[PDB]
């Protein structure tokens, strides 16, 4: 049931748009980025570039790098574990909430955010899209695509140069110095 | 905190875009259609009409009426129970798969589809959008908005005049003529 695409020599996402398809649990296109596994079930080529659908799952760990997107809206829908989401609104106040499976978090464009996984193997459902396309392939770009199944045994830490060549390709703006005012 | 919006007197989706928000499990805008509960956590007003985010849960039931979307792509991502997805491709080849939690189904536009829920209280995470915009307010339109939590105690059966008016507003082609071979 395997295809070959511009993204993977082995994929369960067909290369031709307008094709119905199913993908079993965990078999979307995969990518590592630090301790986490990102799995892509649908990309821009599936939806005339209107949206995507992916999951992000990883071990108990520290708050990911603060960042924003300018033309992209994000969804955080927890399916496993517990994840803490940090958002900063346009005015400037910062809110956090431990999101348990079934809970939902929305981060609008130009809003600074970050998430922390507070249970082992937590999992988040994600959508990331907007006016100027979908940004699913960001993860395998900054990080690495992976043929392995499961969590990375060891974090994939990108060499620092990736943090420049990529942000000007994937609508993402890191804020290496950021604060979080709530604990 | 509850807001008033153009869709609900009481809602956890803010009325104004650019505002980040959290919603607790089950507390999105709710709708009933047949025996199914649809819960909206994000609509077009949140993402500049690019995408939405909703869940669909219901009792073990019959196959929903077969239908198609001219300009809308559908995600089926199963979170509870098990859901059998029926799709017909553009070339007339029908396809059937039982989707268990973590499995993913994709229905591209113009593809005739229908789902059957095969465990009590199965749950599907959906996204329905395309070039034309987002689809979410369809369910409360064909069916009804709902203030209660939990599954409809008894199914909401829309008037046949709703079956005529709604497609003129939402992007749904009902197919009472369609036969599913696969089985
Ligand atoms: O930029 C990032 C981003 O957008 C997401 C993300 C994850 C899950 C979602 O559901 C979502 O909408 C977004 O994760 C990240 C994880 C990192 O380690 C580093 C990042 O830069 C991002
Ligand atoms: O047209 C319909 C539709 O699209 C969906 C749906 C459900 C879950 C999803 O995840 C999704 O993307 C779509 O349900 C329906 C249920 C009905 O009783 C009648 C319908 O006409 C639809
Ligand atoms: Ni982000
Ligand atoms: Ni449909």
mmCIF file of C-alpha atoms and ligand atoms in Angstrom:
data_model
loop_
_atom_site.group_PDB
_atom_site.id
_atom_site.type_symbol
_atom_site.label_atom_id
_atom_site.label_comp_id
_atom_site.label_asym_id
_atom_site.label_seq_id
_atom_site.Cartn_x
_atom_site.Cartn_y
_atom_site.Cartn_z
ATOM 1 C CA UNK A 1 0.000 0.000 0.000
ATOM 2 C CA UNK A 2 3.127 2.140 -0.351
ATOM 3 C CA UNK A 3 3.688 5.153 -2.619
ATOM 4 C CA UNK A 4 6.718 7.226 -3.590
ATOM 5 C CA UNK A 5 6.484 11.024 -3.332
ATOM 6 C CA UNK A 6 8.609 14.169 -3.524
ATOM 7 C CA UNK A 7 8.858 13.984 0.270
ATOM 8 C CA UNK A 8 9.498 10.289 0.881
ATOM 9 C CA UNK A 9 10.641 7.306 -1.121
ATOM 10 C CA UNK A 10 8.140 5.458 1.074
ATOM 11 C CA UNK A 11 4.848 7.141 1.996
ATOM 12 C CA UNK A 12 1.204 6.315 2.631
ATOM 13 C CA UNK A 13 0.140 9.724 1.307
ATOM 14 C CA UNK A 14 -0.411 9.328 -2.460
ATOM 15 C CA UNK A 15 1.380 11.853 -4.724
ATOM 16 C CA UNK A 16 -1.689 12.526 -6.917
ATOM 17 C CA UNK A 17 -4.152 15.068 -5.451
ATOM 18 C CA UNK A 18 -7.840 14.207 -5.534
ATOM 19 C CA UNK A 19 -7.125 10.663 -4.351
ATOM 20 C CA UNK A 20 -8.993 9.283 -1.321
ATOM 21 C CA UNK A 21 -6.730 7.453 1.136
ATOM 22 C CA UNK A 22 -6.430 5.847 4.575
ATOM 23 C CA UNK A 23 -3.408 5.719 6.837
ATOM 24 C CA UNK A 24 -3.076 3.401 9.808
ATOM 25 C CA UNK A 25 -2.046 4.792 13.191
ATOM 26 C CA UNK A 26 1.513 6.097 13.171
ATOM 27 C CA UNK A 27 2.214 5.568 9.464
ATOM 28 C CA UNK A 28 2.010 9.158 8.164
ATOM 29 C CA UNK A 29 5.239 10.804 6.956
ATOM 30 C CA UNK A 30 7.470 11.043 10.021
ATOM 31 C CA UNK A 31 9.990 13.561 11.330
ATOM 32 C CA UNK A 32 12.071 14.058 14.486
ATOM 33 C CA UNK A 33 12.743 17.418 16.140
ATOM 34 C CA UNK A 34 14.396 17.193 19.547
ATOM 35 C CA UNK A 35 12.588 14.594 21.627
ATOM 36 C CA UNK A 36 9.405 14.680 19.585
ATOM 37 C CA UNK A 37 7.913 12.730 16.694
ATOM 38 C CA UNK A 38 5.826 14.669 14.166
ATOM 39 C CA UNK A 39 3.637 12.573 11.874
ATOM 40 C CA UNK A 40 2.019 14.013 8.779
ATOM 41 C CA UNK A 41 -1.244 12.524 7.528
ATOM 42 C CA UNK A 42 -2.171 15.266 5.037
ATOM 43 C CA UNK A 43 -0.227 18.101 3.426
ATOM 44 C CA UNK A 44 -0.877 21.115 1.205
ATOM 45 C CA UNK A 45 -0.747 18.964 -1.932
ATOM 46 C CA UNK A 46 -3.778 17.126 -0.610
ATOM 47 C CA UNK A 47 -5.918 20.209 -0.052
ATOM 48 C CA UNK A 48 -5.002 22.755 -2.774
ATOM 49 C CA UNK A 49 -2.783 24.299 -0.108
ATOM 50 C CA UNK A 50 -5.662 25.238 2.208
ATOM 51 C CA UNK A 51 -4.805 23.098 5.300
ATOM 52 C CA UNK A 52 -2.894 20.104 6.670
ATOM 53 C CA UNK A 53 -3.256 17.467 9.418
ATOM 54 C CA UNK A 54 -0.467 16.106 11.612
ATOM 55 C CA UNK A 55 0.327 14.860 15.115
ATOM 56 C CA UNK A 56 3.119 15.758 17.479
ATOM 57 C CA UNK A 57 4.133 13.334 20.213
ATOM 58 C CA UNK A 58 7.034 13.164 22.647
ATOM 59 C CA UNK A 59 8.397 12.384 26.138
ATOM 60 C CA UNK A 60 8.026 14.431 29.305
ATOM 61 C CA UNK A 61 10.302 17.400 28.682
ATOM 62 C CA UNK A 62 11.134 21.087 28.790
ATOM 63 C CA UNK A 63 9.254 23.949 27.116
ATOM 64 C CA UNK A 64 9.946 24.059 23.359
ATOM 65 C CA UNK A 65 11.457 27.167 21.698
ATOM 66 C CA UNK A 66 9.208 30.244 21.909
ATOM 67 C CA UNK A 67 8.118 31.376 18.431
ATOM 68 C CA UNK A 68 5.400 32.822 16.228
ATOM 69 C CA UNK A 69 3.965 32.636 12.719
ATOM 70 C CA UNK A 70 2.848 35.606 10.618
ATOM 71 C CA UNK A 71 0.394 34.048 8.173
ATOM 72 C CA UNK A 72 -0.315 30.795 9.993
ATOM 73 C CA UNK A 73 -2.893 29.762 12.588
ATOM 74 C CA UNK A 74 -2.200 26.777 14.854
ATOM 75 C CA UNK A 75 -4.365 24.201 16.580
ATOM 76 C CA UNK A 76 -3.501 22.203 19.706
ATOM 77 C CA UNK A 77 -5.850 19.227 20.311
ATOM 78 C CA UNK A 78 -4.621 16.810 22.942
ATOM 79 C CA UNK A 79 -5.184 13.107 22.357
ATOM 80 C CA UNK A 80 -2.802 11.585 24.919
ATOM 81 C CA UNK A 81 -0.993 12.596 28.088
ATOM 82 C CA UNK A 82 -1.038 16.204 29.260
ATOM 83 C CA UNK A 83 0.445 19.215 27.497
ATOM 84 C CA UNK A 84 0.945 22.739 28.864
ATOM 85 C CA UNK A 85 0.419 25.469 26.248
ATOM 86 C CA UNK A 86 1.874 28.968 26.582
ATOM 87 C CA UNK A 87 0.269 31.761 24.572
ATOM 88 C CA UNK A 88 0.831 35.507 24.406
ATOM 89 C CA UNK A 89 -1.940 37.652 22.934
ATOM 90 C CA UNK A 90 -1.415 40.720 20.742
ATOM 91 C CA UNK A 91 -1.998 43.081 23.686
ATOM 92 C CA UNK A 92 0.607 41.231 25.725
ATOM 93 C CA UNK A 93 -0.936 39.171 28.523
ATOM 94 C CA UNK A 94 0.262 35.578 28.871
ATOM 95 C CA UNK A 95 -1.962 32.631 29.709
ATOM 96 C CA UNK A 96 -1.167 28.958 30.208
ATOM 97 C CA UNK A 97 -3.317 25.870 30.617
ATOM 98 C CA UNK A 98 -2.614 22.209 31.180
ATOM 99 C CA UNK A 99 -4.485 20.608 28.278
ATOM 100 C CA UNK A 100 -5.707 17.037 28.912
ATOM 101 C CA UNK A 101 -6.927 14.684 26.160
ATOM 102 C CA UNK A 102 -9.965 16.200 24.487
ATOM 103 C CA UNK A 103 -8.951 19.738 25.504
ATOM 104 C CA UNK A 104 -8.172 22.300 22.785
ATOM 105 C CA UNK A 105 -5.775 25.230 22.262
ATOM 106 C CA UNK A 106 -5.815 27.853 19.492
ATOM 107 C CA UNK A 107 -2.881 30.151 18.630
ATOM 108 C CA UNK A 108 -3.662 32.969 16.104
ATOM 109 C CA UNK A 109 -1.047 34.512 13.789
ATOM 110 C CA UNK A 110 1.594 36.835 15.309
ATOM 111 C CA UNK A 111 0.932 35.288 18.712
ATOM 112 C CA UNK A 112 4.027 34.017 20.523
ATOM 113 C CA UNK A 113 3.687 30.480 21.861
ATOM 114 C CA UNK A 114 5.309 27.347 23.254
ATOM 115 C CA UNK A 115 4.219 23.988 24.670
ATOM 116 C CA UNK A 116 5.500 21.646 27.366
ATOM 117 C CA UNK A 117 4.745 17.931 27.551
ATOM 118 C CA UNK A 118 4.028 16.921 31.143
ATOM 119 C CA UNK A 119 3.397 13.198 30.751
ATOM 120 C CA UNK A 120 5.528 10.572 29.023
ATOM 121 C CA UNK A 121 4.486 10.052 25.392
ATOM 122 C CA UNK A 122 1.937 12.866 25.303
ATOM 123 C CA UNK A 123 0.379 13.462 21.879
ATOM 124 C CA UNK A 124 -1.102 16.521 20.177
ATOM 125 C CA UNK A 125 -3.268 16.814 17.085
ATOM 126 C CA UNK A 126 -2.223 19.779 14.976
ATOM 127 C CA UNK A 127 -3.362 21.995 12.170
ATOM 128 C CA UNK A 128 -1.086 24.764 10.905
ATOM 129 C CA UNK A 129 -2.319 26.886 7.988
ATOM 130 C CA UNK A 130 -3.352 30.359 6.844
ATOM 131 C CA UNK A 131 -3.554 32.818 3.906
ATOM 132 C CA UNK A 132 -0.176 31.806 2.486
ATOM 133 C CA UNK A 133 -0.197 28.010 2.596
ATOM 134 C CA UNK A 134 0.496 25.103 4.949
ATOM 135 C CA UNK A 135 3.694 24.578 6.947
ATOM 136 C CA UNK A 136 3.815 20.847 7.778
ATOM 137 C CA UNK A 137 7.169 20.239 6.062
ATOM 138 C CA UNK A 138 8.836 22.692 8.470
ATOM 139 C CA UNK A 139 9.448 19.917 10.996
ATOM 140 C CA UNK A 140 11.480 17.619 8.728
ATOM 141 C CA UNK A 141 13.367 20.679 7.422
ATOM 142 C CA UNK A 142 14.539 22.150 10.727
ATOM 143 C CA UNK A 143 14.741 18.629 12.114
ATOM 144 C CA UNK A 144 15.016 15.433 10.077
ATOM 145 C CA UNK A 145 12.580 13.138 8.290
ATOM 146 C CA UNK A 146 12.575 9.617 9.748
ATOM 147 C CA UNK A 147 11.837 6.120 8.544
ATOM 148 C CA UNK A 148 11.821 4.781 12.103
ATOM 149 C CA UNK A 149 8.581 4.217 13.955
ATOM 150 C CA UNK A 150 8.107 5.489 17.524
ATOM 151 C CA UNK A 151 9.760 8.187 19.617
ATOM 152 C CA UNK A 152 13.351 9.149 18.809
ATOM 153 C CA UNK A 153 15.654 7.259 21.199
ATOM 154 C CA UNK A 154 17.785 10.400 21.383
ATOM 155 C CA UNK A 155 16.843 14.009 20.536
ATOM 156 C CA UNK A 156 17.563 15.276 17.041
ATOM 157 C CA UNK A 157 19.197 18.623 17.719
ATOM 158 C CA UNK A 158 19.522 20.740 14.559
ATOM 159 C CA UNK A 159 22.861 22.415 13.889
ATOM 160 C CA UNK A 160 22.432 26.169 14.618
ATOM 161 C CA UNK A 161 22.588 27.173 10.929
ATOM 162 C CA UNK A 162 19.254 25.402 10.315
ATOM 163 C CA UNK A 163 17.636 27.993 12.587
ATOM 164 C CA UNK A 164 18.268 30.628 9.911
ATOM 165 C CA UNK A 165 18.034 28.918 6.528
ATOM 166 C CA UNK A 166 14.607 27.540 7.497
ATOM 167 C CA UNK A 167 12.714 30.376 9.291
ATOM 168 C CA UNK A 168 12.891 32.193 5.966
ATOM 169 C CA UNK A 169 11.097 29.314 4.277
ATOM 170 C CA UNK A 170 8.398 28.186 6.699
ATOM 171 C CA UNK A 171 6.605 31.178 8.284
ATOM 172 C CA UNK A 172 8.195 30.744 11.709
ATOM 173 C CA UNK A 173 9.956 33.324 13.872
ATOM 174 C CA UNK A 174 11.917 32.185 16.919
ATOM 175 C CA UNK A 175 12.201 34.325 20.038
ATOM 176 C CA UNK A 176 15.307 32.758 21.675
ATOM 177 C CA UNK A 177 14.928 35.239 24.507
ATOM 178 C CA UNK A 178 11.385 34.918 25.804
ATOM 179 C CA UNK A 179 10.116 34.892 29.360
ATOM 180 C CA UNK A 180 6.782 33.313 30.401
ATOM 181 C CA UNK A 181 5.360 35.120 33.437
ATOM 182 C CA UNK A 182 3.420 32.406 35.278
ATOM 183 C CA UNK A 183 5.688 29.576 36.463
ATOM 184 C CA UNK B 1 -14.814 32.334 30.205
ATOM 185 C CA UNK B 2 -17.960 32.399 28.044
ATOM 186 C CA UNK B 3 -18.453 34.851 25.190
ATOM 187 C CA UNK B 4 -21.402 35.918 23.090
ATOM 188 C CA UNK B 5 -20.897 35.457 19.364
ATOM 189 C CA UNK B 6 -22.842 35.620 16.119
ATOM 190 C CA UNK B 7 -23.307 31.851 16.418
ATOM 191 C CA UNK B 8 -24.095 31.273 20.125
ATOM 192 C CA UNK B 9 -25.371 33.394 23.007
ATOM 193 C CA UNK B 10 -22.879 31.397 25.088
ATOM 194 C CA UNK B 11 -19.601 30.155 23.566
ATOM 195 C CA UNK B 12 -15.931 29.611 24.388
ATOM 196 C CA UNK B 13 -14.856 30.732 20.934
ATOM 197 C CA UNK B 14 -14.127 34.475 21.156
ATOM 198 C CA UNK B 15 -16.035 36.748 18.749
ATOM 199 C CA UNK B 16 -12.843 38.567 17.653
ATOM 200 C CA UNK B 17 -9.985 37.100 15.523
ATOM 201 C CA UNK B 18 -6.383 37.358 16.700
ATOM 202 C CA UNK B 19 -7.457 36.228 20.167
ATOM 203 C CA UNK B 20 -5.905 33.028 21.533
ATOM 204 C CA UNK B 21 -8.204 30.762 23.539
ATOM 205 C CA UNK B 22 -8.467 27.415 25.297
ATOM 206 C CA UNK B 23 -11.555 25.212 25.364
ATOM 207 C CA UNK B 24 -12.058 22.278 27.693
ATOM 208 C CA UNK B 25 -13.076 18.842 26.417
ATOM 209 C CA UNK B 26 -16.641 18.968 25.094
ATOM 210 C CA UNK B 27 -17.165 22.734 25.392
ATOM 211 C CA UNK B 28 -16.915 23.874 21.755
ATOM 212 C CA UNK B 29 -20.054 25.053 19.925
ATOM 213 C CA UNK B 30 -22.369 22.071 19.817
ATOM 214 C CA UNK B 31 -24.758 20.675 17.219
ATOM 215 C CA UNK B 32 -26.999 17.628 16.807
ATOM 216 C CA UNK B 33 -27.632 15.854 13.519
ATOM 217 C CA UNK B 34 -29.343 12.485 13.662
ATOM 218 C CA UNK B 35 -27.846 10.700 16.646
ATOM 219 C CA UNK B 36 -24.531 12.508 16.286
ATOM 220 C CA UNK B 37 -22.999 15.272 18.376
ATOM 221 C CA UNK B 38 -20.805 17.731 16.479
ATOM 222 C CA UNK B 39 -18.561 20.010 18.505
ATOM 223 C CA UNK B 40 -16.813 23.005 16.906
ATOM 224 C CA UNK B 41 -13.559 24.267 18.483
ATOM 225 C CA UNK B 42 -12.548 26.568 15.602
ATOM 226 C CA UNK B 43 -14.416 28.005 12.634
ATOM 227 C CA UNK B 44 -13.584 30.103 9.573
ATOM 228 C CA UNK B 45 -13.755 33.337 11.597
ATOM 229 C CA UNK B 46 -10.676 32.188 13.497
ATOM 230 C CA UNK B 47 -8.421 31.318 10.584
ATOM 231 C CA UNK B 48 -9.386 33.888 7.933
ATOM 232 C CA UNK B 49 -11.675 31.317 6.311
ATOM 233 C CA UNK B 50 -8.772 28.899 5.694
ATOM 234 C CA UNK B 51 -9.636 26.006 8.057
ATOM 235 C CA UNK B 52 -11.718 24.745 10.993
ATOM 236 C CA UNK B 53 -11.556 22.102 13.735
ATOM 237 C CA UNK B 54 -14.386 19.931 15.039
ATOM 238 C CA UNK B 55 -15.250 16.547 16.511
ATOM 239 C CA UNK B 56 -18.089 14.239 15.642
ATOM 240 C CA UNK B 57 -19.353 11.638 18.118
ATOM 241 C CA UNK B 58 -22.370 9.338 18.194
ATOM 242 C CA UNK B 59 -23.946 5.947 19.005
ATOM 243 C CA UNK B 60 -23.301 2.772 17.025
ATOM 244 C CA UNK B 61 -25.600 3.560 14.123
ATOM 245 C CA UNK B 62 -26.371 3.223 10.436
ATOM 246 C CA UNK B 63 -24.312 4.523 7.527
ATOM 247 C CA UNK B 64 -24.946 8.277 7.243
ATOM 248 C CA UNK B 65 -26.497 9.404 3.924
ATOM 249 C CA UNK B 66 -23.921 9.155 1.109
ATOM 250 C CA UNK B 67 -22.893 12.596 -0.155
ATOM 251 C CA UNK B 68 -20.195 14.663 -1.874
ATOM 252 C CA UNK B 69 -18.496 18.050 -1.600
ATOM 253 C CA UNK B 70 -17.708 20.135 -4.698
ATOM 254 C CA UNK B 71 -15.066 22.331 -3.106
ATOM 255 C CA UNK B 72 -14.347 20.867 0.315
ATOM 256 C CA UNK B 73 -11.694 18.432 1.595
ATOM 257 C CA UNK B 74 -12.487 16.241 4.628
ATOM 258 C CA UNK B 75 -10.295 14.733 7.321
ATOM 259 C CA UNK B 76 -11.419 11.740 9.382
ATOM 260 C CA UNK B 77 -9.158 11.145 12.370
ATOM 261 C CA UNK B 78 -10.592 8.613 14.787
ATOM 262 C CA UNK B 79 -10.138 9.266 18.520
ATOM 263 C CA UNK B 80 -12.551 6.768 20.136
ATOM 264 C CA UNK B 81 -14.479 3.640 19.184
ATOM 265 C CA UNK B 82 -14.175 2.603 15.545
ATOM 266 C CA UNK B 83 -15.482 4.258 12.410
ATOM 267 C CA UNK B 84 -15.954 2.638 8.979
ATOM 268 C CA UNK B 85 -15.230 5.092 6.154
ATOM 269 C CA UNK B 86 -16.737 4.606 2.685
ATOM 270 C CA UNK B 87 -15.329 6.620 -0.228
ATOM 271 C CA UNK B 88 -15.696 6.453 -4.011
ATOM 272 C CA UNK B 89 -12.776 7.772 -6.060
ATOM 273 C CA UNK B 90 -13.126 9.994 -9.149
ATOM 274 C CA UNK B 91 -12.921 6.865 -11.326
ATOM 275 C CA UNK B 92 -15.778 5.033 -9.609
ATOM 276 C CA UNK B 93 -13.752 2.638 -7.465
ATOM 277 C CA UNK B 94 -15.303 2.461 -3.993
ATOM 278 C CA UNK B 95 -13.215 1.925 -0.870
ATOM 279 C CA UNK B 96 -13.962 0.793 2.661
ATOM 280 C CA UNK B 97 -11.883 0.730 5.814
ATOM 281 C CA UNK B 98 -12.586 0.365 9.512
ATOM 282 C CA UNK B 99 -10.711 3.188 11.212
ATOM 283 C CA UNK B 100 -9.670 2.656 14.827
ATOM 284 C CA UNK B 101 -8.265 5.382 17.094
ATOM 285 C CA UNK B 102 -5.169 6.968 15.589
ATOM 286 C CA UNK B 103 -6.134 5.907 12.065
ATOM 287 C CA UNK B 104 -6.734 8.554 9.415
ATOM 288 C CA UNK B 105 -9.061 8.840 6.432
ATOM 289 C CA UNK B 106 -9.074 11.547 3.757
ATOM 290 C CA UNK B 107 -11.958 12.505 1.492
ATOM 291 C CA UNK B 108 -10.963 14.823 -1.386
ATOM 292 C CA UNK B 109 -13.627 16.948 -3.080
ATOM 293 C CA UNK B 110 -16.116 15.446 -5.551
ATOM 294 C CA UNK B 111 -15.584 12.084 -3.849
ATOM 295 C CA UNK B 112 -18.803 10.463 -2.671
ATOM 296 C CA UNK B 113 -18.471 9.388 0.940
ATOM 297 C CA UNK B 114 -20.276 8.120 4.012
ATOM 298 C CA UNK B 115 -19.304 6.860 7.462
ATOM 299 C CA UNK B 116 -20.684 4.293 9.877
ATOM 300 C CA UNK B 117 -19.953 4.321 13.583
ATOM 301 C CA UNK B 118 -19.375 0.791 14.844
ATOM 302 C CA UNK B 119 -18.866 1.233 18.586
ATOM 303 C CA UNK B 120 -21.114 3.143 20.967
ATOM 304 C CA UNK B 121 -19.819 6.674 21.427
ATOM 305 C CA UNK B 122 -17.228 6.573 18.654
ATOM 306 C CA UNK B 123 -15.419 9.898 18.052
ATOM 307 C CA UNK B 124 -13.952 11.431 14.887
ATOM 308 C CA UNK B 125 -11.784 14.547 14.694
ATOM 309 C CA UNK B 126 -12.660 16.499 11.554
ATOM 310 C CA UNK B 127 -11.417 19.302 9.374
ATOM 311 C CA UNK B 128 -13.604 20.416 6.464
ATOM 312 C CA UNK B 129 -12.290 23.195 4.228
ATOM 313 C CA UNK B 130 -11.116 24.187 0.756
ATOM 314 C CA UNK B 131 -10.611 27.123 -1.639
ATOM 315 C CA UNK B 132 -14.217 28.218 -1.058
ATOM 316 C CA UNK B 133 -13.850 28.327 2.718
ATOM 317 C CA UNK B 134 -14.910 26.399 5.819
ATOM 318 C CA UNK B 135 -17.787 23.973 6.342
ATOM 319 C CA UNK B 136 -18.496 23.753 10.095
ATOM 320 C CA UNK B 137 -21.778 25.650 10.470
ATOM 321 C CA UNK B 138 -23.386 23.069 8.132
ATOM 322 C CA UNK B 139 -24.284 20.674 10.919
ATOM 323 C CA UNK B 140 -26.193 23.172 13.065
ATOM 324 C CA UNK B 141 -27.915 24.372 9.868
ATOM 325 C CA UNK B 142 -29.040 20.981 8.547
ATOM 326 C CA UNK B 143 -29.500 19.833 12.125
ATOM 327 C CA UNK B 144 -29.675 22.166 15.131
ATOM 328 C CA UNK B 145 -27.391 24.069 17.513
ATOM 329 C CA UNK B 146 -27.525 22.526 20.972
ATOM 330 C CA UNK B 147 -26.887 23.776 24.462
ATOM 331 C CA UNK B 148 -26.827 20.417 26.268
ATOM 332 C CA UNK B 149 -23.651 18.380 26.734
ATOM 333 C CA UNK B 150 -23.346 14.737 25.700
ATOM 334 C CA UNK B 151 -24.969 12.636 22.986
ATOM 335 C CA UNK B 152 -28.461 13.544 21.715
ATOM 336 C CA UNK B 153 -30.831 11.570 23.947
ATOM 337 C CA UNK B 154 -32.890 10.936 20.834
ATOM 338 C CA UNK B 155 -31.861 11.686 17.241
ATOM 339 C CA UNK B 156 -32.520 15.066 15.628
ATOM 340 C CA UNK B 157 -34.287 14.314 12.334
ATOM 341 C CA UNK B 158 -34.171 17.329 10.000
ATOM 342 C CA UNK B 159 -37.158 18.390 7.893
ATOM 343 C CA UNK B 160 -36.937 17.394 4.203
ATOM 344 C CA UNK B 161 -37.093 21.121 3.368
ATOM 345 C CA UNK B 162 -33.771 21.485 5.192
ATOM 346 C CA UNK B 163 -32.334 18.862 2.819
ATOM 347 C CA UNK B 164 -33.217 21.218 -0.058
ATOM 348 C CA UNK B 165 -32.250 24.623 1.357
ATOM 349 C CA UNK B 166 -28.936 23.746 3.037
ATOM 350 C CA UNK B 167 -26.886 22.670 -0.027
ATOM 351 C CA UNK B 168 -27.722 26.072 -1.572
ATOM 352 C CA UNK B 169 -25.667 27.456 1.331
ATOM 353 C CA UNK B 170 -23.006 24.924 2.376
ATOM 354 C CA UNK B 171 -21.377 22.685 -0.324
ATOM 355 C CA UNK B 172 -23.007 19.264 0.086
ATOM 356 C CA UNK B 173 -24.413 17.066 -2.676
ATOM 357 C CA UNK B 174 -26.623 14.387 -1.146
ATOM 358 C CA UNK B 175 -26.703 11.073 -3.021
ATOM 359 C CA UNK B 176 -29.771 8.976 -2.041
ATOM 360 C CA UNK B 177 -29.107 7.027 -5.259
ATOM 361 C CA UNK B 178 -25.649 5.783 -4.299
ATOM 362 C CA UNK B 179 -24.889 2.121 -3.612
ATOM 363 C CA UNK B 180 -21.973 0.803 -1.563
ATOM 364 C CA UNK B 181 -20.640 -2.488 -2.895
ATOM 365 C CA UNK B 182 -17.553 -3.133 -0.691
ATOM 366 C CA UNK B 183 -19.644 -3.911 2.403
HETATM 367 O O1 LIG C 1 7.048 26.055 15.244
HETATM 368 C C1 LIG C 1 6.655 25.019 15.822
HETATM 369 C C2 LIG C 1 5.240 24.579 15.760
HETATM 370 O O2 LIG C 1 4.358 25.333 15.056
HETATM 371 C C3 LIG C 1 4.852 23.317 16.470
HETATM 372 C C4 LIG C 1 3.467 22.772 16.528
HETATM 373 C C5 LIG C 1 3.283 21.543 17.157
HETATM 374 C C6 LIG C 1 2.020 20.972 17.289
HETATM 375 C C7 LIG C 1 0.906 21.638 16.803
HETATM 376 O O3 LIG C 1 -0.330 21.088 16.929
HETATM 377 C C8 LIG C 1 1.086 22.958 16.152
HETATM 378 O O4 LIG C 1 0.015 23.644 15.663
HETATM 379 C C9 LIG C 1 2.370 23.479 16.047
HETATM 380 O O5 LIG C 1 5.786 22.606 17.181
HETATM 381 C C10 LIG C 1 7.102 22.963 17.273
HETATM 382 C C11 LIG C 1 8.005 22.194 17.998
HETATM 383 C C12 LIG C 1 9.349 22.557 18.096
HETATM 384 O O6 LIG C 1 10.194 21.766 18.814
HETATM 385 C C13 LIG C 1 9.854 23.697 17.472
HETATM 386 C C14 LIG C 1 9.017 24.525 16.728
HETATM 387 O O7 LIG C 1 9.463 25.648 16.109
HETATM 388 C C15 LIG C 1 7.590 24.181 16.603
HETATM 389 O O1 LIG C 2 -21.713 16.114 5.027
HETATM 390 C C1 LIG C 2 -21.440 15.596 6.132
HETATM 391 C C2 LIG C 2 -20.052 15.620 6.657
HETATM 392 O O2 LIG C 2 -19.090 16.225 5.909
HETATM 393 C C3 LIG C 2 -19.774 15.003 7.994
HETATM 394 C C4 LIG C 2 -18.409 14.931 8.601
HETATM 395 C C5 LIG C 2 -18.254 14.235 9.804
HETATM 396 C C6 LIG C 2 -17.011 14.080 10.413
HETATM 397 C C7 LIG C 2 -15.881 14.617 9.808
HETATM 398 O O3 LIG C 2 -14.651 14.498 10.371
HETATM 399 C C8 LIG C 2 -16.025 15.341 8.523
HETATM 400 O O4 LIG C 2 -14.934 15.878 7.911
HETATM 401 C C9 LIG C 2 -17.292 15.465 7.960
HETATM 402 O O5 LIG C 2 -20.789 14.396 8.690
HETATM 403 C C10 LIG C 2 -22.093 14.344 8.257
HETATM 404 C C11 LIG C 2 -23.076 13.730 9.026
HETATM 405 C C12 LIG C 2 -24.403 13.657 8.602
HETATM 406 O O6 LIG C 2 -25.315 13.038 9.400
HETATM 407 C C13 LIG C 2 -24.822 14.205 7.391
HETATM 408 C C14 LIG C 2 -23.918 14.843 6.550
HETATM 409 O O7 LIG C 2 -24.328 15.373 5.367
HETATM 410 C C15 LIG C 2 -22.489 14.939 6.961
HETATM 411 NI NI1 LIG C 3 3.844 27.175 16.296
HETATM 412 NI NI1 LIG C 4 -18.688 14.761 3.993
#
